[PDB]
């Protein structure tokens, strides 16, 4: 299999960090950037959502969506990190908190970043979610469960959006997010994630 990606974009970094966490290695194929994760006119039919990252299997089957690629790669490389949840309850809690972080945090941050009235509304929803996330991190070491999971990769990208893309002073105002972020950003798999340049 091979992973099609652009050089420095949040969607692709979600998969890159996941792969480093589980100790997997997948051949990369670099693509040109189009506009909004987009693929070229001649390359877009390979991707159902029309975007990178794109995982291509040996017979030509392609999987798009960063989380879908991560799920496939989780089963491709034996590992003990259980990033989608170690037991039945954790698997449901991971699903719950992943969708909460994605809808209330990541997607709103994306909308606010690329944008004026909807971008401002999207930014307000980000600001309203941060106290909810901070309160959660005051009573749980990680977002979804007591252990590091894929939700923490997604949350890290979301907070990276908020601080480095939207100029929100998250860490000044929310010490529990800051505690968790300091912890997660120290993990080996997050090094050279491009955080400092990812949201320029």
The answer to whether the beta carbons of residues 110 and 101 sit under 8 Å apart is no
Could you give the CA distance from residue 77 to residue 94 in angstroms, rounded to a whole number?
20
State how far Cα 174 lies from the chain centre.
20
CA nearest to 104, candidates 82, 130, 76, 81: 130
Q: Scanning residues 56 to 75, which ones bind its own copies (CB under 8 A)?
A: 57, 61, 63-65, 67-69, 71-72, 75
From 4-12, 13-21, 100-108, 145-153, give the range in contact with its own copies by CB under 8 A.
Answer: 100-108
Burial code of 5-21, b = ≥16 C-beta within 10 A, e = fewer? bbeebbbbbbbbbbbbb
Q: Which residue lies nearer to its own copies by CB, 62 or 185?
A: 62
Q: Scanning residues 156 to 195, which ones bind its own copies (CB under 8 A)?
A: none
Q: Which residue lies nearer to its own copies by CB, 20 or 71?
A: 71
Q: Which residue lies nearer to its own copies by CB, 101 or 189?
A: 101
Does position 118 interact with its own copies (CB under 8 A)? The reply is yes
Question: Which of 117, 167, 188, 200 is close enough to bind its own copies by CB under 8 A?
Answer: 117
From 103-111, 147-155, 164-172, 173-181, give the range in contact with its own copies by CB under 8 A.
Answer: 103-111
Q: Strand pairing partners for 29?
A: 4
């Amino acid at each position: 299999m091979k992973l099609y990606e652009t050089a420095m974009t949040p969607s692709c970094k979600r998969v890159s960090i996941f792969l480093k966490e589980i100790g997997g290695e997948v051949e990369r194929v670099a693509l040109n950037v189009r506009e909004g994760d987009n693929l070229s006119e001649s390359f877009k039919q390979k991707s159902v959502n029309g975007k990178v990252p794109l995982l291509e299997l040996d017979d030509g089957t392609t999987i798009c969506e960063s989380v879908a690629i991560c799920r496939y790669l989780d089963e491709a490389f034996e590992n003990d990190l259980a990033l989608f949840g170690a037991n039945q309850l954790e698997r449901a809690q991971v699903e719950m908190w992943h969708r909460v972080v994605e809808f209330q945090g990541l997607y709103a941050a994306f909308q606010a970043f690329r944008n004026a009235a909807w971008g401002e509304e999207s930014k307000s929803r980000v600001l309203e979610f941060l106290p909810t996330l901070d309160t959660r991190l005051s009573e749980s070491e990680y977002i979804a469960t007591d252990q590091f999971s894929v939700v923490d990769i997604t949350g890290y990208i979301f907070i990276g959006f908020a601080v480095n893309g939207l100029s929100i002073e998250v860490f000044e105002k929310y010490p529990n997010i800051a505690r968790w972020f300091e912890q997660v950003s120290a993990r080996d798999a997050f090094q050279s994630s491009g955080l400092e340049v990812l949201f320029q």
